[PDB]
Amino acid sequence: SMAPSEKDIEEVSVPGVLAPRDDVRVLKTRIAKLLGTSPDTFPGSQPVSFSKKHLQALKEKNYFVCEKSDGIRCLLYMTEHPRYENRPSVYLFDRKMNFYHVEKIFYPVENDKSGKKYHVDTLLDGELVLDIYPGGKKQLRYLVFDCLACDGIVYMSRLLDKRLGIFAKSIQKPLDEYTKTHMRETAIFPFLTSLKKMELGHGILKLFNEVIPRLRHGNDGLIFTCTETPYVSGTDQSLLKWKPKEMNTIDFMLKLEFAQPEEGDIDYSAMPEFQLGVWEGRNMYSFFAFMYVDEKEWEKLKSFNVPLSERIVECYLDDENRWRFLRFRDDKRDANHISTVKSVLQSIEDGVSKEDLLKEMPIIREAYYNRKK
Amino acid sequence: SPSYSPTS
Structure with a gap:
């Protein structure tokens, strides 16, 4: 052979175009003003490698654990286009602060049947993965594992359950309702969006034996997310990644x-x-x-x-x-x-x-x- | 306010 x-390697490629340089200055400024950070500083959290001392940490605090996927970690930003103030625009951006503009993507607002209302000032943390189906069919998916801001409101200071709670109700729920009845319009989306499969910190065995071998994408370890701590920009000593x-x-x-x-x-x-x-x-x-x-x-x-x-x-x-x-x-x-x-x-x-x-x-x-x- | 919680 x-x-x-x-x-x-099945390599996921961001289904978008790089945002122009003048556009990213506006976005970085807009994001920093929303979160209270520095404009050229990545607001996302970075995990620390799982060490021996982290066995004790898991005993002292409540934790969630999810599968760490073969994909691209990026933040999703729902906003308005820097040049067209009346055009809803979604951006993906990684730790190197490279913005990708994704078109034909749409997040419905709850109870709005007109379909004209859209979200702004919304910032998610997730992973872009490529799910493989029989027949050589490919499906891009964005797995949300945290919410930094939802509809202008900053949730970084809240705990994990509240951060993921607001995303599920305000974003995931309407999108699910919409998808059930607008299946045709959904299939044009560059990718599908879903909340990541999570378990309690001690449900590791279930991940290894049941969840991970059934995924339609690849795996390279586990992420441990503390449910008793606020979202931290940069290196988070409570966010642990484990890897064989x-x-x-x-x-x-x-x-x-x-x-x-x-x-x-x-x-x-x-x-x-x-x-x-x-x-x-x-x-x-x-x-x-x-x-x-x-x-x-x-x-x-x-x-x-x-x-x-x-x-x-x-x-x-x-x-x-x-x-x-x-x-x-x-x-x-x-x-x-x-x-x-x-x-x-x-x-x-x-x-x-x-x-x-x-x-x-x-x-x-x-x-x-x-x-x- | 909403909250996420799996089991088990």
Whole structure:
């Protein structure tokens, strides 16, 4: 078969056009005025990597947990077009503050049967995912997991249940009503919008065994959201992302080195050394590790009949903490920078295994009920 | 005011 590559990955692409530069200045100004932040500062929250100390944290406070999807984290902003004050416009924007204008998308207002009324000053936190259906059909979906503002009112200072509560009633409910009767008009939407499937902090097992294997998109871990804390812009020490070791991948520069024998010539059919290199300076690479390859994989690699050396590969750590080939990355000019590699490995060193996480669940459950007393 | 709450 073909060599595993980035083309195997179902990659969600934002179904919109980049907003013009003059337009984003207005939006950033408009958003900052609404939230009370700095205009060029991303108002979204960022999670911290799940560490060992976070087992105790889950025992002390009420938590929700959801599936962390393979997709794009972006904020959805319902507003009016910066150039056309009478035109309802929806924007998606990521942590790099890149605004995408999405057309033909529409969020109904409750009890308005005219269909002319629309929401403004509404800001959601969610994930853009690509659901795969049989027959090679694709469906873009936006999974809402938090609400920063709804109809001019800032909910950041409220708790999670209230934030998600206002979204469900004011936005999700009318859209559901609308979709039931306007199915034709719904199918033109660039994407569908829904509240994310959530569980109580101790319902981890249910996620692993029932929810995650039934999703129509990919998964790369869990998100733990505290229900006792306000929404925090930037790094939130109470928002935890967990991820198995096998999903903490690194891009390396692969380089093959063949044993130069003293007698005769080189046997190229024999397994060489697989050197993994880290990118530092300009075109300056440094040795970092050897990729472990067994005989069966080496034959498989040769059977690909593609160049192996001098290209970017994504690798993962196995149970023996050996770096293993995952796929080629043709979409990368260079391997990860040493600073990036260090960060990933730190998340692994302070990591918690899936077994330890599960075996700590019942204690987390009983403490949750001792608080409900 | 509305509130979100799953189980279990």
